[PDB]
Write a structure and sequence with these properties.
The structure is cut from a larger assembly and holds 14 protein chains of eleven kinds.
Chain A (H helix, E strand, L loop, with lengths): L13 H23 L1
Chain C lengths: L6 H24 L4
Chain I lengths: L7 H23 L5
The chains are: A mainly alpha (37), B alpha+beta (490), C mainly alpha (34), D mainly alpha (340), E mainly alpha (32), F mainly alpha (34), G mainly alpha (65), H mainly alpha (49), I mainly alpha (35), J mainly alpha (82), K mainly alpha (37).
Cofactor (chain I): heme b
Keywords (chain I): Acetylation, Electron transport, Heme, Iron, Membrane, Metal-binding, Photosynthesis, Photosystem II, Thylakoid, Transmembrane, Transmembrane helix, Transport
Membrane topology (chain I): Single-pass membrane protein
Chain lengths: 37, 490, 34, 340, 32, 34, 65, 49, 35, 82, 37, 34, 37, 32
């Protein structure tokens, strides 16, 4: 097979990881109360 | 390289892997359908279609399967409550089975189309580079759609070569799958007439077949092809989404307001039926009729079919409930067992009182009793210090007619107040709270959930449209701008 | 207390799954030569 | 061709740019603003809510409003020439026709306006991130003034156009929907409150990290309208916050995108919450809490306290807030604490 | 069980905080 | 030619007058309480 | 590229790529059905909203059986 | 076509297949698919025996 | 320059200017109604 | 920085403008005043006059209770000298 | 057939077209009165 | 049935956590240039 | 600070991922029964 | 709930199987 020429690499910098995690965690801190209801 | 939220752009012009992608998607949606069914079949109780129907057991997929014919199980039972019936292969199990397989096949297909992405069919003879002639495709697809649309209305809904669809009386008591004859008259545009759902698919189907051919032949006017940046697939998206959310906002409305497409015996009552005391009026009408034909109050009320009384209970109003009040309606008030009967309240003077019902808006509501003219005669006081209408001071009593408590009367204040406290919700019923370990807090019906989910998705999809649309008409200025300083001078 | 049984796993998967996603990327980014 | 000539004229750079969009924007936008200003001073809400609602009756800028139609009307579009008003204008006014007028007109006016942004952007050749942003205010209007009442019994329960008439909409949602306890509303405020922070903080950060490009104290004149160097020390700003807050920006492109995201995402969440309040699918209670409160009479949280406040709001307001229900709540049935 | 869940996430956010402030990517000038 | 600064201060007082009439009307009109 | 049985049979259907009609082609004719559709929707909408009543059409759970 | 069946036999016996569906395979592959599918369904939803 | 009079701006300006004053006049009269 | 329109500043300063608007502005004003003071506004908008909220005795509100026969119902509300 | 509300619908469908008319009338006209290049 | 409440989350975290570990590595390996 | 010279890169090939997952999944299929007990 | 968990894991192993057989790293000779 021919190596598909439409692919690019993917990236996520350190800050984005942090900004990411902060969002996930706080959302969890916000919705957990309603999940346990 | 690519940001996380762009990883899928790797397909913007790779028709092969784009098909490989949509194949996998379709596989998952078909897969979900099959397996969500099995989940319902493993937990749905057919033991009683009257007081414990699918819409009380938090069933979501099971109704959509009945609306088009499938109303039986290989195990013998059936949605309408009949026995000895032979659903054939197309039973709920069957449907569920089918989807699971169709998913497996679409999977394998998705795989093949991924590895063999560079088929020539996607390369333009002229430019020798990947390309898809959108305008002609749309014509093709649209032709197939209308062709299938036609068939669905023509053979399925009509019964010609199919089952039909769900049809019921004005008070969901007789409902079932029946062949529906078309309706091209004016009343065929009435949401509550089945004939309209048939005619539509035949008419729209044909128009769809016609319109399709046109687009397979006539080409897009230069002006347009330029304007609506055709030959650029990321615009087919912008338009599709706009249609998809349009469709969405509509199904959300027909589910909430009701239509021949969302029958109460499959999705539950409507909040507006409770608002206008819909079922309350049908009951009275019947009861007063029985009294005319010389029946006693006992006989009159006893004639009222349980199912009919059940719809006249606020615990089936989709407007009651909460966002995180999960599960079936049964985890709320409990599994309905029987109708205790109509409660008639009277005071020492013999006068008949009436319990002011609970408006959907109110989580909690006070117990107030008035006569025919609406004069407050009795109530349950907050501050007893100066209560003038306490059930005690008024000698309020309660009597029942037809049902569990039929022929009985209760006069001890506590017991009287208990039922009065219950009358507020309409017809009083007997629930089994044990089984599901209910908490006694109202939950909404599938009608309610479907309506909420789709009203949201739609409003969310609008943003998708506005986003993708923009990104198509501004592809050039994407990544940024450049030079000059013109502005304020034509 | 009288909470939801699925509350715990709903919160757990809600935290792990997407956090796990990010981490998978960051680390794969972080390790790309040059 | 006339079209390109029609175009030519419209897209002409005037004082107040018209454009194709304008053919939709200006007619509606003016009618919406006009209808309000009309009702605000002349039309009454007597036959609709048993309320005086215009200057002509004695209402002031705060108490004035264009009240919703009766509950009888239902979700009727209430057209001037519809079954209700029957072409008559005065009747139309008294049946709250001016509400659906302002609503529906203003609705299209917001479509036109976003289209304008889209159209003007294209011409000037800039990116449409001003249009994306404006989706948030649309969602709000759509969900609150349309989707919400569309889920209720009628337009009567939509927010009436007016200052005070909006405060009761707030109080209502508290009392009936316990809206403040809703996860989506919270995100909402988090966005607006947090968005009003970014605004303030970034502004101040810039004005006090500026380079000196003039000899005056009033550094406003000292600005180069024609780009070139950064007018403020982005490098100094970074170090500042990095030492006082611990975290600090360092990519103006991101800092500015962030400023779009925060308040627009917030408003979107607050919308979803209301879209659920339409079906009354609220975030009213916590079941685990209620169950313990039932069995145990000494368990008290700031949550239980609030619910009692709601009970009072519903019981004391409902009568004159929902006339069509002919409510009569005897003094003895009215929930009340001690002495008060 | 719930208490544990609430405190955990909180403890996780504070952990994040730490790493974000003291283990960020050093902000490099010009030649970046 | 009418000097701008006069156009303003005249149109200015003119507004304080009308808006002030409104404020008086709050203690006499229908918007009163008496 | 990679031709295939099915691939060739379908080759015609996908080839007329950039092919556009000249000038304002069918546009005006299209702009008529569009206006018709717009009016069509407004009708069925106003019928559902009971703004346009028509003896024979009873927009309720009734008119059913 | 060099002869359909002649080809068929050349494919089946082909040593260029990812999985060598043999002659025995022609009996194997179907029987094993029946066994597994029935099993998986039985083990999950079959009733008391 | 040789500026024109009736322009689009003019139209706009008046659609808001004319009614406004008409209202400010109306309201101003209301300040005297009583009972 | 410019377009065809004649710079407001010039116009708001032109003696011609005021010669026009000293007439026009107060005109509109006195008109609107009369609109209210002649009781016309009350009829154009069906707005109750201070003595037209209730009938002398009645203390009930003229709440419109049904859409289609609303206009008819409203008219009847004006009947009881309301 | 042709009920009062149906008559009103035409009245509104007609009074609407008119507005679209006069609007596009005036526009197309004034548009073709200046635009030199 | 009458199973353990934590059984679900115990099995879930037992699968995710270590699988998640591997994937993080594989993907970070996979994306190393040359 | 000086870039610590004791660090090497980490690797996990595709087969290892598979062999890994196979181990995790099957163990889960073996202990879940005892977890739910 | 338990049934779902058992079937899920099983389905995941079968998924693995597929990928392992058809999406392995091609086994290259000599020059590896
Ligand atoms: C985005 C970008 C911005 C775009 C802006 C576009 C602006 C255009 C706005 C036009 C809105 C018109 C909608 C009018 C409407 O809906 O009107 C409502 C009507 C239904 O009207 C209702 O009808 C009745 C419902 O009772 C039902 O139940 C029984 C008991 O009463 C009766 O028999 C009754 O006849 C039966 O219909 C009641 O009388 C109600 O009070 C009400 O009148 O729905 C219908 O027309 C059909 C609904 C069509 C779907 C669209 C609605 C959107 C989804 C909302 C879902 C809620 C959440
Ligand atoms: C949208 C389509 C849909 C709909 C309408 C329903 C509807 C329903 N399902 Mg259901 N279901 C669906 C999809 C859907 N399902 C899917 C895809 C699955 C597979 C996972 C299931 C699996 C499932 C199960 C296993 C069960 C149901 C059940 C039910 C019924 C009970 C209602 C419920 O529990 O509400 C619950 C509603 C929620 C808790 C609301 C979720 C809202 C979330 C919290 C918002 C998230 C916000 C987000 C994080 C914010 C971030 C944004 C920010 C970063 C910008 C109900 C009829 C139950 C049933 O059988 O009843 C007997 C049941 O047991 N469903
Ligand atoms: C072999 C073909 C096939 C068949 C016969 C069915 C049949 C069925 N499916 Mg189904 N399904 C299929 C393929 C099929 N599916 C595939 C490939 C998928 C994956 C995408 C699904 C996914 C799926 C799900 C997720 C669900 C079903 C469901 C159902 C059942 C309810 C049907 C329903 O009401 O549809 C509703 C039909 C519509 C959505 C209307 C479509 C009309 C659109 C809005 C118009 C599109 C615009 C159009 C192009 C404009 C041009 C038209 C022109 C004429 C004017 C029914 C038994 C439901 C069920 O109850 O679960 C088992 C269900 O939840 N299916
Ligand atoms: C019709 C469906 C549809 C389709 C096919 C696409 C397709 C696409 N969108 Mg998209 N989009 C849609 C709807 C759709 N969108 C809607 C409704 C919105 C508004 C909410 C958006 C908002 C949007 C934005 C803001 C962007 C895109 C982008 C893109 C492109 C890159 C996708 C990407 O790599 O994501 C990567 C996906 C992931 C790695 C993250 C997904 C995480 C989600 C949010 C969690 C939920 C997962 C869950 C399974 C979803 C359930 C599905 C639900 C609908 C039933 C791609 C062409 C991007 C693009 O333009 O790039 C330049 C881009 O920036 N879209
Ligand atoms: C162009 C901007 C614009 C837009 C989009 C609207 C839009 C609207 N106005 Mg409106 N309006 C505008 C300008 C505009 N207005 C202006 C400038 C004025 C001042 C004169 C008004 C004054 C006004 C009033 C007084 C009222 C409205 C109302 C309405 C709403 C309902 C009217 C309706 O049913 O239309 C119907 C749509 C059409 C007529 C479009 C038809 C287009 C087709 C292509 C022509 C076909 C004609 C042909 C004869 C049909 C052949 C079919 C055959 C079978 C008979 C609607 C939202 C009503 C409302 O607010 O109710 C609450 C209302 O009472 N407007
Ligand atoms: C931003 C936009 C966000 C918009 C959200 C739009 C959501 C629309 C509403 C959809 C409703 C359908 C919900 C389906 C799920 C369901 O019904 O379960 C509902 C479940 C089960 O419901 C159960 O029902 C009965 C048992 O059959 C009983 O009554 C039980 O007590 C229980 O109620 O209840 C919950 O646990 C609620 C928790 C949901 C929290 C989500 C956690 C997220 C997990 C992510 C995992 C990712 C894995 C990869
Ligand atoms: C005294 C010290 C007080 C301690 C303050 C703690 C601050 C929290 C830091 C959070 C991490 C920030 C981050 O990861 O982004 C780190 C980034 C900085 O890194 C960014 O990197 C690049 C982006 O691609 C760009 O160069 C940006 O300009 C920027 O430099 O911060 C941001 O850009 C986003 C700004 C918003 C920061 C979040 C505010 C914190 C609010 C916390 C609320 C949660 C509370 C929960 C309570 C339980
Ligand atoms: C050309 C440019 C003009 C474009 C107009 C755009 C619309 C501007 C907003 C209109 C505000 C109307 C206020 C008004 O008319 O009050 C008119 C009222 C009339 O006052 C009433 O008079 C009598 C009525 O019978 C009674 O005595 C009442 O009690 C009341 O006093 O004046 C006030 O009482 C309030 C004082 C004015 C306060 C206005 C502040 C507005 C601030 C918000 C600005 C928008 C953001
Ligand atoms: C291969 C094959 C086969 C098999 C197949 C199968 C077995 C399949 C399965 C499939 C499946 C079994 C699938 C499933 C799917 C599912 C899904 C896809 C789901 C999803 C979900 C979701 C997405 C959700 C979400 C959410 C949440 C979570 C919460 C919130 C809300 C919401 C809803 C959003 C056979 C043998 C036939 C043969 C051929 C081959
Ligand atoms: C309704 C309607 C319509 C319309 C009409 C119109 C369009 C109107 C307009 C109107 C208007 C357009 C009005 C206006 C008004 C205004 C006013 C009345 C104003 C006032 C102001 C003031 C008072 C000010 C104040 C102030 C401020 C705010 C700031 C600070 C300072 C001062 C103090 C200055 C039509 C017929 C179409 C149809 C039917 C319906
Ligand atoms: C874009 C769409 C814009 C539409 C704008 C329409 C505005 C005019 O709307 C039109 O108003 C006139 C009153 O002036 C109404 O006319 C109504 O009142 C008049 C008396 O005043 C009656 O003689 C007539 O029988 C009655 O229908 C029309 O029924 C209505 O259709
Ligand atoms: Fe800035």
């Amino acid at each position: 097979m021919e190596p598909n020429p439409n692919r690019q690499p993917v990236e996520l910098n350190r800050t984005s990881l942090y900004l990411g995690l902060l969002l996930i965690l706080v959302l969890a801190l916000l919705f957990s109360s309603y999940f346990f209801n | 390289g690519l940001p996380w939220y762009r990883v899928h752009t790797v397909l913007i012009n790779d028709p092969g892997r784009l098909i490989a992608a949509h194949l996998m998607h379709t596989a998952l949606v078909a897969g979900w359908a099959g397996s969500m069914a099995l989940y319902e079949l493993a937990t749905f109780d057919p033991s009683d279609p009257v007081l414990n129907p699918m819409w009380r057991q938090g069933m979501f997929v099971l109704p959509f399967m009945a609306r088009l014919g499938v109303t039986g199980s290989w195990s013998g039972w059936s949605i309408t409550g009949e026995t000895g019936i032979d659903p054939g292969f197309w039973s709920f199990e069957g449907v569920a089975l089918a989807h699971i397989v169709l998913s497996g096949l679409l999977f394998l297909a998705a795989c093949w189309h991924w590895v063999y992405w560079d088929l020539e069919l996607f390369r333009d003879p002229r430019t020798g580079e990947p390309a898809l002639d959108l305008p002609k495709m749309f014509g093709i697809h649209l032709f197939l759609a209308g062709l299938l649309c036609f068939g669905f209305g023509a053979f399925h809904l009509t019964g010609l070569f199919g089952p039909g669809m769900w049809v019921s009386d004005p008070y969901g008591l007789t409902g079932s799958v029946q062949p529906v004859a078309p309706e091209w008259g004016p009343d065929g545009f009435n949401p509550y007439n089945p004939g309209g759902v048939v005619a539509h698919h035949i008419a729209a189907g044909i128009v769809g077949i016609i319109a399709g051919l046109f687009h397979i032949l006539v080409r897009p006017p230069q002006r347009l092809y330029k304007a609506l940046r055709m030959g650029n697939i990321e615009t087919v998206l912008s338009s599709s989404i706009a249609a998809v959310f349009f469709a969405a906002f509509v199904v959300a409305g027909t589910m909430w307001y009701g239509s021949a497409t969302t029958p109460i015996e499959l999705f539950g009552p409507t909040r507006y039926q409770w608002d206008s005391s819909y079922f309350q009026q049908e009951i009275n009408r019947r009861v007063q009729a029985s009294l005319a034909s010389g029946a006693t109050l006992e006989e009159a009320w006893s004639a009222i079919p349980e199912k009919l009384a059940f719809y006249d209970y606020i615990g089936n109003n989709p407007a009651k409930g909460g966002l995180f009040r999960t599960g079936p309606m049964n985890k709320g008030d409990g599994i309905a067992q029987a109708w205790k009967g109509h409660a008639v309240f009277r005071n020492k003077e013999g006068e008949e009182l009436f319990v002011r019902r609970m408006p959907a808006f109110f989580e909690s509501f006070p117990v107030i009793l008035t006569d025919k003219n609406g004069v407050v005669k009795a109530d349950i006081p907050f501050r007893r210090a100066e209560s003038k209408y306490s059930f005690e001071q008024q000698g309020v009593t309660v009597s029942f007619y037809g049902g569990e408590l039929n022929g009985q009367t209760f006069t001890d204040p506590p017991t009287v107040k208990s039922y009065a406290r219950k009358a507020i919700f309409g017809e009083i019923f007997e629930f089994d709270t044990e089984t599901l370990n209910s908490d006694g807090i109202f939950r909404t019906s599938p009608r309610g959930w479907f309506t909420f989910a789709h009203a949201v998705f739609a409003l969310l999809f609008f943003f998708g449209h506005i986003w993708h649309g923009a990104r198509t008409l501004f592809r050039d200025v994407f990544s940024g701008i450049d030079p000059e300083l013109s502005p304020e001078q034509v | 207390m009288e909470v939801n049984q699925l509350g715990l796993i709903a919160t757990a998967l809600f935290v792990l799954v997407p956090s796990v996603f990010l981490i998978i990327l960051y680390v794969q980014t972080e390790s790309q030569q040059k | 061709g006339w079209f390109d000539i029609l175009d030519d004229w419209l897209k002409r750079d005037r004082f107040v740019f018209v454009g194709w969009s304008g053919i939709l924007l200006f007619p509606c936008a003016y009618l919406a603003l006009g209808g309000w200003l009309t009702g605000t001073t002349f039309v009454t809400s007597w036959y609709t809510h048993g309320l005086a609602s215009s200057y002509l009756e004695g209402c002031n800028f705060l108490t004035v409003a264009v009240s919703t139609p009766a509950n009888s009307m239902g979700h009727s579009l209430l057209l001037l020439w519809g079954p209700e008003a029957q072409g008559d204008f005065t009747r139309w006014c008294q049946l709250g026709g001016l509400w659906t007028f302002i609503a529906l007109h203003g609705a299209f006016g917001l479509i036109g306006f976003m289209l304008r942004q889209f159209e003007i952007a294209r011409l000037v050749g800039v990116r449409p991130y001003n249009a994306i942003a404006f989706s948030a205010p649309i969602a709000v209007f759509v969900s609150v003034f349309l989707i919400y009442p569309l889920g209720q019994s009628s337009w009567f329960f939509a927010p009436s156009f007016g200052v005070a008439a909006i405060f009761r909409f707030l109080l209502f949602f508290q009392g009936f929907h316990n809206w403040t306890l809703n996860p989506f509303h919270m995100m909402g405020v988090a966005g607006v409150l947090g968005g009003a922070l970014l605004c303030a903080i970034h502004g101040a950060t810039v004005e006090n990290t500026l380079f000196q490009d003039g000899e005056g104290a009033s550094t406003f004149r000292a600005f180069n309208p024609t780009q070139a160097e950064e007018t403020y020390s982005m490098v100094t700003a970074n170090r500042f916050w990095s030492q006082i807050f611990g975290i600090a920006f360092s990519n103006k492109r991101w800092l500015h995108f962030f400023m779009l995201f925060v308040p627009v995402t917030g408003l979107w969440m607050s919308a979803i919450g209301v879209v659920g309040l339409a079906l009354n699918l609220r975030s009213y209670d916590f079941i685990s809490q209620e169950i313990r409160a039932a069995e145990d009479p000494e368990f008290e949280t700031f949550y239980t306290k609030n619910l009692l406040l709601n009970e009072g709001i519903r019981a004391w307001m409902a009568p004159q807030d929902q006339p069509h229900e002919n409510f009569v709540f005897p003094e003895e049935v009215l929930p009340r604490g001690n002495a008060l | 069980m719930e208490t544990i869940t609430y405190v955990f996430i909180f403890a996780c956010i504070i952990a994040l905080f730490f790493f974000a402030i003291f283990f960020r990517e050093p902000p490099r000038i010009t030649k970046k | 030619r009418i000097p701008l600064w006069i156009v303003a201060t005249v149109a200015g007082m003119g507004v304080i007058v009308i808006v002030g009439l409104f404020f008086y009307g709050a203690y006499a009109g229908l918007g009163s309480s008496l | 590229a990679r031709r295939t049985w099915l691939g060739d049979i379908l080759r015609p259907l996908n080839s007329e790529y950039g092919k556009v009609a000249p000038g304002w082609g069918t546009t005006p004719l299209m702009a008529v059905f569009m206006g018709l559709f717009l009016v069509f929707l407004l009708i069925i909408l106003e019928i559902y909203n009971s703004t346009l009543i028509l003896d024979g059409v009873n927009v309720s759970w009734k008119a059913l059986g | 076509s060099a002869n359909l069946w002649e080809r068929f036999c050349n494919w089946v016996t082909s040593t260029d297949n990812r999985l060598y569906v043999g002659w025995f395979g022609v009996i194997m592959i179907p029987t094993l698919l029946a066994a597994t599918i029935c099993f998986v369904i039985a083990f999950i939803a079959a009733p008391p025996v | 320059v040789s500026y024109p009079i009736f322009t689009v701006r003019w139209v706009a300006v008046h659609t808001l200017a004319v009614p406004t004053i008409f209202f400010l006049g109306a309201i101003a009269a209301m300040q005297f109604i009583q009972r | 920085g410019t377009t065809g329109e004649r710079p407001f500043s010039d116009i708001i300063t032109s003696v011609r403008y005021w010669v026009i608007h000293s007439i026009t502005i107060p005109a509109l004003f006195i008109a609107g005043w009369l609109f209210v003071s002649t009781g016309l506004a009350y009829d154009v908008f069906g707005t109750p006059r201070p003595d037209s909220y209730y009938a002398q005795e009645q203390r009930s509100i003229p709440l419109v209770t049904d859409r289609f026969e609303a206009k008819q119902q409203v008219e009847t509300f004006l009947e009881q000298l309301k | 057939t042709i009920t009062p509300s149906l008559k009103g619908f035409f009245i509104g469908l007609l009074s609407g077209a008119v507005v679209l008319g006069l609007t596009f009338a005036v526009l197309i006209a004034i548009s073709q009165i200046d635009k030199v290049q």
